[PDB]
PDB file of C-alpha atoms in Angstrom:
ATOM      1  CA  UNK A   1     -10.777  10.270  -5.240  1.00 52.00           C
ATOM      2  CA  UNK A   2      -7.575  12.084  -4.114  1.00 51.44           C
ATOM      3  CA  UNK A   3      -4.512  10.872  -6.086  1.00 49.97           C
ATOM      4  CA  UNK A   4      -1.240   9.605  -4.706  1.00 49.54           C
ATOM      5  CA  UNK A   5       1.474   7.018  -5.206  1.00 51.14           C
ATOM      6  CA  UNK A   6       3.602   4.452  -3.457  1.00 53.09           C
ATOM      7  CA  UNK A   7       7.223   3.274  -3.807  1.00 51.15           C
ATOM      8  CA  UNK A   8       9.557   0.681  -2.515  1.00 50.40           C
ATOM      9  CA  UNK A   9      12.373   3.171  -2.696  1.00 53.41           C
ATOM     10  CA  UNK A  10      13.019   6.453  -0.810  1.00 53.37           C
ATOM     11  CA  UNK A  11      11.418   9.607  -1.905  1.00 53.32           C
ATOM     12  CA  UNK A  12      14.311  11.690  -2.924  1.00 53.89           C
ATOM     13  CA  UNK A  13      13.795  15.112  -4.483  1.00 53.32           C
ATOM     14  CA  UNK A  14      14.643  13.438  -7.860  1.00 51.82           C
ATOM     15  CA  UNK A  15      11.843  10.811  -7.446  1.00 53.53           C
ATOM     16  CA  UNK A  16       9.309  13.384  -6.248  1.00 53.46           C
ATOM     17  CA  UNK A  17      10.081  15.697  -9.253  1.00 54.34           C
ATOM     18  CA  UNK A  18       9.721  12.586 -11.554  1.00 53.32           C
ATOM     19  CA  UNK A  19       6.318  11.983 -10.221  1.00 55.34           C
ATOM     20  CA  UNK A  20       5.259  15.700 -10.107  1.00 56.90           C
ATOM     21  CA  UNK A  21       6.238  16.431 -13.665  1.00 57.10           C
ATOM     22  CA  UNK A  22       5.556  13.016 -15.417  1.00 56.04           C
ATOM     23  CA  UNK A  23       2.407  11.815 -13.549  1.00 52.29           C
ATOM     24  CA  UNK A  24       0.891  14.445 -11.307  1.00 50.71           C
ATOM     25  CA  UNK A  25       0.977  15.995  -7.849  1.00 50.75           C
ATOM     26  CA  UNK A  26       0.598  13.118  -5.229  1.00 50.23           C
ATOM     27  CA  UNK A  27      -1.462  13.990  -2.088  1.00 50.71           C
ATOM     28  CA  UNK A  28      -0.043  10.981  -0.328  1.00 52.84           C
ATOM     29  CA  UNK A  29       2.873   8.646  -0.796  1.00 53.02           C
ATOM     30  CA  UNK A  30       2.995   5.156   0.438  1.00 48.65           C
ATOM     31  CA  UNK A  31       6.338   4.179   2.032  1.00 44.05           C
ATOM     32  CA  UNK A  32       7.689   1.353   4.160  1.00 41.08           C
ATOM     33  CA  UNK A  33       8.360   1.459   7.895  1.00 41.05           C
ATOM     34  CA  UNK A  34      11.403  -0.838   7.741  1.00 37.98           C
ATOM     35  CA  UNK A  35      13.955  -2.205   5.274  1.00 38.19           C
ATOM     36  CA  UNK A  36      13.363  -5.629   3.661  1.00 38.25           C
ATOM     37  CA  UNK A  37      16.304  -6.655   1.427  1.00 38.16           C
ATOM     38  CA  UNK A  38      15.358  -6.979  -2.186  1.00 42.06           C
ATOM     39  CA  UNK A  39      11.991  -5.568  -1.463  1.00 42.39           C
ATOM     40  CA  UNK A  40      11.742  -2.173   0.237  1.00 41.29           C
ATOM     41  CA  UNK A  41      13.705   0.684   1.592  1.00 39.32           C
ATOM     42  CA  UNK A  42      12.810   1.896   4.948  1.00 38.17           C
ATOM     43  CA  UNK A  43      11.626   5.392   5.903  1.00 39.62           C
ATOM     44  CA  UNK A  44      13.857   7.772   7.785  1.00 42.47           C
ATOM     45  CA  UNK A  45      13.116  10.971   9.714  1.00 42.61           C
ATOM     46  CA  UNK A  46      15.040  13.006   6.988  1.00 42.90           C
ATOM     47  CA  UNK A  47      12.841  11.491   4.245  1.00 45.07           C
ATOM     48  CA  UNK A  48       9.607  12.106   6.160  1.00 48.27           C
ATOM     49  CA  UNK A  49      10.670  15.905   6.609  1.00 49.31           C
ATOM     50  CA  UNK A  50      11.141  16.033   2.758  1.00 48.23           C
ATOM     51  CA  UNK A  51       7.884  14.489   1.931  1.00 49.07           C
ATOM     52  CA  UNK A  52       6.073  16.815   4.171  1.00 46.94           C
ATOM     53  CA  UNK A  53       7.923  19.813   2.722  1.00 44.45           C
ATOM     54  CA  UNK A  54       6.065  19.022  -0.534  1.00 45.82           C
ATOM     55  CA  UNK A  55       2.680  19.088   1.224  1.00 49.11           C
ATOM     56  CA  UNK A  56       2.405  15.257   0.800  1.00 49.95           C
ATOM     57  CA  UNK A  57       1.110  12.884   3.451  1.00 52.51           C
ATOM     58  CA  UNK A  58       3.052   9.800   4.326  1.00 47.75           C
ATOM     59  CA  UNK A  59       1.131   6.679   4.076  1.00 49.29           C
ATOM     60  CA  UNK A  60       3.119   4.142   6.240  1.00 52.29           C
ATOM     61  CA  UNK A  61       3.277   0.437   5.395  1.00 52.61           C
ATOM     62  CA  UNK A  62       4.600  -2.456   7.558  1.00 54.62           C
ATOM     63  CA  UNK A  63       5.866  -5.341   5.386  1.00 53.71           C
ATOM     64  CA  UNK A  64       8.477  -7.195   7.408  1.00 56.11           C
ATOM     65  CA  UNK A  65       6.300 -10.428   7.604  1.00 55.77           C
ATOM     66  CA  UNK A  66       5.649 -13.022   4.937  1.00 55.35           C
ATOM     67  CA  UNK A  67       2.454 -14.738   6.296  1.00 55.61           C
ATOM     68  CA  UNK A  68      -0.421 -13.428   8.280  1.00 50.10           C
ATOM     69  CA  UNK A  69      -1.661 -16.421  10.344  1.00 49.66           C
ATOM     70  CA  UNK A  70      -2.041 -16.660  14.173  1.00 50.71           C
ATOM     71  CA  UNK A  71      -2.972 -14.221  16.880  1.00 49.41           C
ATOM     72  CA  UNK A  72       0.547 -14.127  18.409  1.00 51.55           C
ATOM     73  CA  UNK A  73       2.089 -13.465  14.955  1.00 49.34           C
ATOM     74  CA  UNK A  74      -0.320 -10.487  14.430  1.00 51.13           C
ATOM     75  CA  UNK A  75       0.546  -8.994  17.850  1.00 50.59           C
ATOM     76  CA  UNK A  76       4.328  -9.257  17.026  1.00 49.74           C
ATOM     77  CA  UNK A  77       3.675  -7.530  13.684  1.00 51.45           C
ATOM     78  CA  UNK A  78       1.692  -4.772  15.276  1.00 51.39           C
ATOM     79  CA  UNK A  79       4.165  -4.158  18.044  1.00 49.08           C
ATOM     80  CA  UNK A  80       7.057  -4.002  15.447  1.00 49.61           C
ATOM     81  CA  UNK A  81       5.061  -1.558  13.265  1.00 50.18           C
ATOM     82  CA  UNK A  82       4.405   0.675  16.277  1.00 51.04           C
ATOM     83  CA  UNK A  83       8.029   0.480  17.249  1.00 52.38           C
ATOM     84  CA  UNK A  84       9.151   1.673  13.912  1.00 51.99           C
ATOM     85  CA  UNK A  85       6.437   4.340  13.677  1.00 52.15           C
ATOM     86  CA  UNK A  86       7.514   5.851  16.968  1.00 51.90           C
ATOM     87  CA  UNK A  87      11.264   5.639  16.141  1.00 49.81           C
ATOM     88  CA  UNK A  88      10.254   7.676  13.009  1.00 48.20           C
ATOM     89  CA  UNK A  89       8.274  10.238  15.019  1.00 50.18           C
ATOM     90  CA  UNK A  90       4.928   9.440  13.393  1.00 50.14           C
ATOM     91  CA  UNK A  91       2.295  10.893  15.652  1.00 47.74           C
ATOM     92  CA  UNK A  92      -0.673   9.105  17.333  1.00 47.35           C
ATOM     93  CA  UNK A  93      -4.080   8.687  15.765  1.00 49.82           C
ATOM     94  CA  UNK A  94      -2.445   7.795  12.327  1.00 45.57           C
ATOM     95  CA  UNK A  95      -2.832   4.676  10.253  1.00 44.00           C
ATOM     96  CA  UNK A  96      -0.265   1.919   9.959  1.00 42.72           C
ATOM     97  CA  UNK A  97      -1.038  -0.465   7.053  1.00 38.01           C
ATOM     98  CA  UNK A  98      -0.095  -4.117   7.148  1.00 39.20           C
ATOM     99  CA  UNK A  99       1.064  -5.395   3.707  1.00 37.99           C
ATOM    100  CA  UNK A 100      -0.976  -8.689   3.141  1.00 39.02           C
ATOM    101  CA  UNK A 101      -0.075  -9.758  -0.294  1.00 39.64           C
ATOM    102  CA  UNK A 102      -2.527 -11.918  -2.185  1.00 41.21           C
ATOM    103  CA  UNK A 103      -0.433 -15.189  -1.954  1.00 43.04           C
ATOM    104  CA  UNK A 104      -0.022 -14.949   1.818  1.00 38.93           C
ATOM    105  CA  UNK A 105      -1.913 -17.351   4.137  1.00 38.90           C
ATOM    106  CA  UNK A 106      -4.250 -15.179   6.224  1.00 39.10           C
ATOM    107  CA  UNK A 107      -6.481 -15.933   9.042  1.00 39.48           C
ATOM    108  CA  UNK A 108      -9.040 -14.047  11.126  1.00 41.39           C
ATOM    109  CA  UNK A 109      -6.882 -14.388  14.303  1.00 39.47           C
ATOM    110  CA  UNK A 110      -3.979 -12.364  12.818  1.00 37.00           C
ATOM    111  CA  UNK A 111      -6.323  -9.569  11.673  1.00 35.34           C
ATOM    112  CA  UNK A 112      -7.863  -9.494  15.136  1.00 33.31           C
ATOM    113  CA  UNK A 113      -4.437  -9.195  16.663  1.00 33.09           C
ATOM    114  CA  UNK A 114      -3.350  -6.506  14.218  1.00 36.27           C
ATOM    115  CA  UNK A 115      -6.422  -4.476  15.147  1.00 36.06           C
ATOM    116  CA  UNK A 116      -6.586  -5.210  18.957  1.00 36.81           C
ATOM    117  CA  UNK A 117      -2.795  -4.643  19.480  1.00 34.73           C
ATOM    118  CA  UNK A 118      -2.757  -1.351  17.766  1.00 36.39           C
ATOM    119  CA  UNK A 119      -5.790   0.143  19.744  1.00 34.12           C
ATOM    120  CA  UNK A 120      -4.053   1.148  23.020  1.00 37.61           C
ATOM    121  CA  UNK A 121      -0.965   2.542  21.117  1.00 36.09           C
ATOM    122  CA  UNK A 122      -3.042   5.221  19.464  1.00 35.31           C
ATOM    123  CA  UNK A 123      -2.160   4.041  15.995  1.00 35.48           C
ATOM    124  CA  UNK A 124      -5.076   3.000  13.665  1.00 35.65           C
ATOM    125  CA  UNK A 125      -5.046  -0.368  11.927  1.00 36.10           C
ATOM    126  CA  UNK A 126      -4.640  -0.382   8.161  1.00 37.52           C
ATOM    127  CA  UNK A 127      -4.865  -3.463   5.912  1.00 34.87           C
ATOM    128  CA  UNK A 128      -3.416  -3.466   2.355  1.00 37.03           C
ATOM    129  CA  UNK A 129      -4.731  -6.419   0.657  1.00 35.67           C
ATOM    130  CA  UNK A 130      -6.501  -7.770  -2.398  1.00 35.27           C
ATOM    131  CA  UNK A 131     -10.190  -8.546  -1.470  1.00 37.17           C
ATOM    132  CA  UNK A 132     -10.581 -10.680  -4.761  1.00 39.46           C
ATOM    133  CA  UNK A 133      -7.733 -13.155  -4.576  1.00 42.44           C
ATOM    134  CA  UNK A 134      -6.494 -15.314  -1.664  1.00 38.62           C
ATOM    135  CA  UNK A 135      -7.487 -15.624   1.887  1.00 38.91           C
ATOM    136  CA  UNK A 136      -7.906 -11.991   2.927  1.00 39.01           C
ATOM    137  CA  UNK A 137     -11.550 -11.317   2.267  1.00 37.42           C
ATOM    138  CA  UNK A 138     -12.917 -14.351   4.198  1.00 38.06           C
ATOM    139  CA  UNK A 139     -10.457 -13.801   7.084  1.00 35.57           C
ATOM    140  CA  UNK A 140     -11.452 -10.152   7.304  1.00 34.25           C
ATOM    141  CA  UNK A 141     -15.123 -10.981   7.205  1.00 31.03           C
ATOM    142  CA  UNK A 142     -14.817 -13.718   9.883  1.00 30.33           C
ATOM    143  CA  UNK A 143     -12.814 -11.177  12.054  1.00 32.96           C
ATOM    144  CA  UNK A 144     -15.519  -8.666  11.699  1.00 31.26           C
ATOM    145  CA  UNK A 145     -18.258 -11.098  12.748  1.00 31.29           C
ATOM    146  CA  UNK A 146     -16.268 -12.124  15.803  1.00 29.09           C
ATOM    147  CA  UNK A 147     -15.521  -8.481  16.598  1.00 28.42           C
ATOM    148  CA  UNK A 148     -17.393  -5.586  15.056  1.00 25.11           C
ATOM    149  CA  UNK A 149     -14.598  -3.222  16.015  1.00 25.41           C
ATOM    150  CA  UNK A 150     -12.497  -4.783  13.125  1.00 28.10           C
ATOM    151  CA  UNK A 151     -14.878  -3.086  10.765  1.00 27.58           C
ATOM    152  CA  UNK A 152     -15.039   0.117  12.846  1.00 30.09           C
ATOM    153  CA  UNK A 153     -11.306   0.613  13.390  1.00 28.45           C
ATOM    154  CA  UNK A 154      -9.582  -0.964  10.363  1.00 31.03           C
ATOM    155  CA  UNK A 155      -9.069   0.836   7.081  1.00 33.78           C
ATOM    156  CA  UNK A 156      -8.562  -1.058   3.823  1.00 29.22           C
ATOM    157  CA  UNK A 157      -6.261  -0.160   1.034  1.00 29.66           C
ATOM    158  CA  UNK A 158      -7.445  -2.456  -1.676  1.00 33.20           C
ATOM    159  CA  UNK A 159      -5.187  -3.809  -4.426  1.00 35.77           C
ATOM    160  CA  UNK A 160      -8.077  -4.662  -6.834  1.00 36.15           C
ATOM    161  CA  UNK A 161      -9.079  -4.168  -9.528  1.00 32.75           C
ATOM    162  CA  UNK A 162      -5.937  -2.999 -11.290  1.00 32.24           C
ATOM    163  CA  UNK A 163      -6.724  -1.292 -14.605  1.00 31.40           C
ATOM    164  CA  UNK A 164      -3.198   0.030 -14.885  1.00 27.63           C
ATOM    165  CA  UNK A 165      -1.189   3.243 -13.905  1.00 30.39           C
ATOM    166  CA  UNK A 166      -2.122   6.588 -15.324  1.00 29.93           C
ATOM    167  CA  UNK A 167      -1.281  10.194 -14.975  1.00 29.16           C
ATOM    168  CA  UNK A 168      -3.280  11.835 -12.214  1.00 32.33           C
ATOM    169  CA  UNK A 169      -5.642  13.707 -14.592  1.00 31.98           C
ATOM    170  CA  UNK A 170      -6.355  10.504 -16.351  1.00 29.95           C
ATOM    171  CA  UNK A 171      -7.194   8.400 -13.140  1.00 30.71           C
ATOM    172  CA  UNK A 172     -10.292   6.361 -13.167  1.00 29.83           C
ATOM    173  CA  UNK A 173     -13.333   6.867 -11.082  1.00 28.79           C
ATOM    174  CA  UNK A 174     -12.845   5.670  -7.525  1.00 31.12           C
ATOM    175  CA  UNK A 175     -14.036   2.003  -7.540  1.00 29.81           C
ATOM    176  CA  UNK A 176     -11.980  -0.377  -5.374  1.00 27.73           C
ATOM    177  CA  UNK A 177     -13.059  -3.954  -4.852  1.00 26.43           C
ATOM    178  CA  UNK A 178     -14.151  -4.479  -1.268  1.00 29.85           C
ATOM    179  CA  UNK A 179     -14.689  -7.535   0.921  1.00 28.67           C
ATOM    180  CA  UNK A 180     -18.276  -8.707   1.120  1.00 28.56           C
ATOM    181  CA  UNK A 181     -18.901  -7.313   4.635  1.00 30.98           C
ATOM    182  CA  UNK A 182     -18.569  -3.978   6.445  1.00 32.92           C
ATOM    183  CA  UNK A 183     -15.359  -2.072   5.712  1.00 30.29           C
ATOM    184  CA  UNK A 184     -13.751   1.270   5.402  1.00 28.13           C
ATOM    185  CA  UNK A 185     -12.150   0.959   1.915  1.00 26.93           C
ATOM    186  CA  UNK A 186     -10.462   4.335   1.745  1.00 25.33           C
ATOM    187  CA  UNK A 187      -7.470   3.532  -0.543  1.00 26.57           C
ATOM    188  CA  UNK A 188      -7.160   1.861  -3.956  1.00 24.95           C
ATOM    189  CA  UNK A 189      -3.986   0.841  -5.765  1.00 21.66           C
ATOM    190  CA  UNK A 190      -5.337   0.957  -9.291  1.00 22.50           C
ATOM    191  CA  UNK A 191      -1.974   0.438 -11.028  1.00 21.00           C
ATOM    192  CA  UNK A 192       1.368  -1.000 -10.365  1.00 23.78           C
ATOM    193  CA  UNK A 193       4.902   0.051 -11.800  1.00 24.78           C
ATOM    194  CA  UNK A 194       4.156   3.120 -13.927  1.00 22.93           C
ATOM    195  CA  UNK A 195       7.602   2.902 -15.724  1.00 21.20           C
ATOM    196  CA  UNK A 196       7.897   6.717 -16.302  1.00 19.43           C
ATOM    197  CA  UNK A 197       8.689   6.647 -12.598  1.00 19.66           C
ATOM    198  CA  UNK A 198       9.206   3.683 -10.262  1.00 22.89           C
ATOM    199  CA  UNK A 199       5.974   3.961  -8.415  1.00 22.25           C
ATOM    200  CA  UNK A 200       2.393   2.582  -8.173  1.00 21.16           C
ATOM    201  CA  UNK A 201      -0.661   4.733  -8.432  1.00 21.91           C
ATOM    202  CA  UNK A 202      -3.440   5.119  -5.853  1.00 24.40           C
ATOM    203  CA  UNK A 203      -6.694   6.934  -5.277  1.00 25.21           C
ATOM    204  CA  UNK A 204      -8.166   7.594  -1.847  1.00 25.02           C
ATOM    205  CA  UNK A 205     -11.278   8.725  -0.198  1.00 26.61           C
ATOM    206  CA  UNK A 206     -10.597  12.183   1.465  1.00 30.54           C
ATOM    207  CA  UNK A 207     -11.335  10.715   4.980  1.00 31.04           C
ATOM    208  CA  UNK A 208      -7.904   9.016   4.730  1.00 27.19           C
ATOM    209  CA  UNK A 209      -5.959  12.211   4.819  1.00 25.78           C
ATOM    210  CA  UNK A 210      -6.693  13.042   8.427  1.00 23.24           C
ATOM    211  CA  UNK A 211      -5.152   9.716   9.421  1.00 22.98           C
ATOM    212  CA  UNK A 212      -1.899  10.332   7.518  1.00 23.89           C
ATOM    213  CA  UNK A 213       1.223  12.527   8.611  1.00 26.95           C
TER     214      UNK A 213
END
């Protein structure tokens, strides 16, 4: 596994140096496409320039939605994610991850819309989710049965299991939970809220990196 982090807040030089010196050198950094009050700080072009200046890949996340039900709703989410990605200058054939928290309602139609709406934009669909708690895994597997391209195109960032944050050199073997059907489970959030720095810790399959900016 390749090691990285994610954060609700902007990557300033101060936060990068905290991570670099207290945890390890992140190869990727999960960040949010838009501002959600009390929840996430959005990306800016200036921040992307800095992240890339460190040789770190941006892992973009769309989280301006609180439920993941319905085809039309999934289309709106995808269209908004792409709008923000373009505004930020994220190039085509890069992943955009939908933030599906474990307590959200989720259905197969929403997942289908996320995937299908993204395809002609050139962005690739990502799904951040917990395959072990809540509706995601069944919704995903139904979507795959209905259209195998869900499994071909989508990349999953799994939020389980969660043994806890570590320094990079202490990270566990790559072992994310997966849904019980075909998937590309290429990212794993193995710990949340590291406390020495206000970040979560992740591991990835190296195929991820070619789909990050």
